[PDB]
Amino acid sequence: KETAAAKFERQHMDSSTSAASSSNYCNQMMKSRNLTKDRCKPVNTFVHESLADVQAVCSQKNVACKNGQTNCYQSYSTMSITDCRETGSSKYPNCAYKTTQANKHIIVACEGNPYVPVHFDASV
Ligand SMILES: [Cl-]
Ligand SMILES: [Cl-]
Ligand SMILES: [Cl-]
């Protein structure tokens, strides 16, 4: 089974580009991070910052998570992110995603020793 920290990395980190370059970014990334294997994951955010910068959020501003847990953290700075969401035309195994690039604060839930991100809660 994948660890929670490793699943967060796979689903949410994309440190190799500064920003989405095209409308096809999400289609490509959702496929290659294996988020369309048996079903189309409906929504997923990628963060275009170093792993170290995202991990550092776990010692930044403690905020409530949407679900009422208290282990969420909001980045002090905005980060380059891309939101991927299925469009009307999406139908497994032919998933189809809208790509929306933005620069926003991220909010992550953190757990463990080391205390690292395990869920992406939201952007602001
Ligand atoms: Cl791990
Ligand atoms: Cl995988
Ligand atoms: Cl997400």
From Swiss-Prot:
Q: Which gene encodes it?
A: RNASE1
Q: What is the effect of changing H119A?
A: Loss of activity
Listed under GO cellular component are: extracellular region
Q: Which GO terms describe its biological process?
A: defense response to Gram-positive bacterium
Look up and give the organism this protein is from: Bos taurus (Bovine)
Protein name according to UniProt: Ribonuclease pancreatic
Q: State the tissue distribution.
A: Pancreas.
Predominant location category: secreted
Q: Please list the residues that bind substrate.
A: K7, R10, K41, P42, V43, N44, T45, K66, R85
